[PDB]
Each structure stands twice: as structure tokens, then as C-alpha cells.
Design a protein around this ligand. Sequence first.
Ligand SMILES: *C(#N)N([C])[N]C(=O)OC([C])([C])[C]
Length: 213
Amino acid sequence: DSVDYRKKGYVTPVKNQGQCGSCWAFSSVGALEGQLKKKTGKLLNLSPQNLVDCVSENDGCGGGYMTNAFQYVQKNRGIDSEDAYPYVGQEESCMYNPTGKAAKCRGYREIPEGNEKALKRAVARVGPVSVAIDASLTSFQFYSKGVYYDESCNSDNLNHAVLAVGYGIQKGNKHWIIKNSWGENWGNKGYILMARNKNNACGIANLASFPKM
Ligand SMILES: *C(#N)N([C])[N]C(=O)OC([C])([C])[C]
């Protein structure tokens, strides 16, 4: 009962959003990229700047929703690749070019709020899913190994978007395999295993969605 899309070729390298609040842009590209591998047999790095700069419904470097982002790609008839529209770290004039198009999107599906069971099915039958979490605890910052669980995690204090690229079981503790966007040094090679089926810890299942490519 398990999957790690990292061995599946469903996930690109770990990126570093730096000092821009565009975690939501990385989250969405991950999902789009997982769905690209899924459909065509290969992937590439998609463009979060394109999202930072062009998702008007989002707040650029000041936060945003991946739902808005999936919808943008669809309405926009695509999104660029990393090469065509490169991450710069700050919000700028939308510079989208149809020549860079490297993924399409034709809608999205939100997971019923808080239903971890359903998120486990979407990860299984769909792929890497976009989720959001409380990442404000210190324990999270210094996360290194093992299965992250902290009692002060507030599922009502959502403040960071990430990516669920799998789920498994370690030494008897169930887990979500989470790709973050703080660089590959952060956590464990840029990843953190976050408790699963533990009362929706950190709100892992409160804001989960995915694109329909
Ligand atoms: C990232 N980085 N941003 C700032 N966080 C974020 O957008 O969190 C919500 C709004 C919950 C998606």
C-alpha cells in the first residue's frame, strides 16, 4: 500500500523559491509536471514565474492558490517551461509566450476538505497532488529525518503550499512524501515525510487539488 512518484520519474529536481512567497507556483508546476509524465511518458521543469507573474487572481510573491493557477493555465491554453520563462525570484510584468508552451490543463479537482482517505486515492489513481500546510512551526524548519509529527501543528493555520509525491510506512508510522521548495538542502534532500491518518496533521488534507491534463 504505497507509492513514491520519485522513483517513477514523476518528479523534477527540488527548487528553491528563495525570498519570494511563490510556494504556490512550485506546488502547481509539480502537479502539472506529474501529469505530464503520466500522459506522455516524459516531463520537464515547468515555469512558476509564469504563474507568479500571470495569475492575477493570486498575489504573486505575497501568496496564492494553485486552484487559481490550474485555471489560469487552462484559460491561458498553457504554461511555459522553465527555460522559456525563467525563475527570477520577484514579480514582474507577465511575459508569457505561446512558443514556450510545454503543458496543458483543462481543469482541476479539489479533494474534499480534510478527507485524507480521498487524498490517498488521488495520489494513487492521479499522481503527485498539490497540498497546503501549517509550516510555521520550528520543528518543521529543522526537520531532517523520520516522520514529522508535532502537536502544535494547527490545521486551521494554513500558510505553505507543497507537493505530495507519495505515501508510505516507516518503522510503523504512516506518512505523506512531501516535496517542498526551499532547496535540496532543506529537510531531507528537500523532502519531508509528514504524518498520515493522524487527524489530518498540519492540515495536510484541507486544501488538496490536482489538474486534469
Ligand atoms: C507560499 N510561499 N505561500 C506564501 N503560501 C501560501 O500561499 O499558502 C497558502 C495561501 C495557504 C496556499
